[PDB]
A paper describes a structure:
MarR proteins were produced from three iad and three iac loci and their binding affinities for IAA were measured. Crystal structures for the IAA-binding IacR MarRs from P. putida, E. soli and A. baumannii and IadR MarR from B. japonicum were determined and refined to 1.5–2.8 Å resolution. We also provide crystal structures of MarR regulators from P. putida, E. soli, Bradyrhizobium japonicum and A. baumannii.
Residue numbers in the entry:
A (entry chain A), B (entry chain A): -14 to 154
């Protein structure tokens, strides 16, 4: 029984349920490998270990790495926005931003449009560390992503986006 | 400079680097949305919030949920194997298994082939909670995954697997 945004409760078609059972973990030892979120979780976890392990050298962690690349891409950003893009809790994000200010990697500054919003931007040191991050990326990633065509990867991004956009909160 | 498993260091072709730069976060505000791991991370995080939030009712968390569905699919499993499949640290896994024994959801038992290996299996209560997990899955997931064809989803699983298999440790 779902509500689909209403004051009533709806029991979905046995069709929707059959299709969904083609993908759900069940009593069969290989059900799990049909589940797209299983694979998203497994890929995220194996990737997370790889990147943490190799970004080691630069004496930062992947939390700081994402903050820096989000600031880089955006130029100036909402700590909020950086957190969002970096898949972080706002508290985790704020904590790591100040750790990067303390290291002289980013400048934080009151937003000109609205003093409350803390904007973030790189320092000269921030920018050199970006190229270092990009080079460690080259090393660890070039083989993996050169194993796919431009078509496969753009398609995969599209499907991941479609998934991301159907989920709510 | 990479080693590719040898005693020498190799500088990859400017080709591999150009292709890789089609996908990496860079100074362009939309570089990030070309990056497959960005999307894997974002989907994993949005999914994680959704499932934790809705598995709430059953008074378990998604860590326990995955343990139960891995035990379910396998019948009897290595706590090791359950941890692996559930994308958990072995310590996290062992901790949650005993929490589920304490709740009478799983039986733990010395492996018949090798007494050290702790095997896990469901209880009658475990099995009823499986169908409850499957029904909460129906509610929260049926819409999202009925938004894709069988072809799109099997393809997406395949590409995620290919990624998972090229990464190492
Ligand atoms: O969190 C999820 O739903 C995905 C997932 C990762 N490992 C799993 C093991 C069993 C069932 C689902 C999953
Ligand atoms: O962890 C990753 O590499 C993926 C990712 C998630 N959010 C990001 C923001 C900027 C750059 C990469 C990422
Ligand atoms: Ni997960
Ligand atoms: Ni990540």
């Amino acid at each position: 029984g779902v509500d689909l945004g209403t004051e009533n409760l709806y029991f979905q078609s046995n069709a929707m349920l059959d299709h969904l059972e083609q993908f759900l973990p069940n009593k069969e030892p290989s059900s799990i490998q049909n589940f797209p979120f299983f694979w998203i979780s497994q890929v995220n976890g194996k990737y997370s270990q790889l990147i943490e392990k190799s970004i080691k050298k630069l004496g930062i962690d992947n939390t700081r790495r994402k903050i820096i690349l989000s600031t880089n891409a955006l130029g100036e950003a909402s700590i909020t926005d950086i957190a969002n893009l970096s898949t972080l809790k706002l508290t985790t994000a704020t904590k790591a931003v100040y750790r990067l200010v303390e290291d002289g990697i980013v400048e934080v500054y009151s937003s000109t449009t609205d003093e409350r919003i803390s904007m973030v931007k790189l320092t000269a040191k921030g920018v050199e560390l970006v190229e270092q991050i990009n080079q460690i990326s080259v090393v660890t990633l070039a083989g993996i992503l050169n194993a796919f065509s431009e078509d496969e990867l753009h398609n995969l991004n599209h499907q991941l986006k479609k998934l991301f956009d159907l989920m709510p909160s």
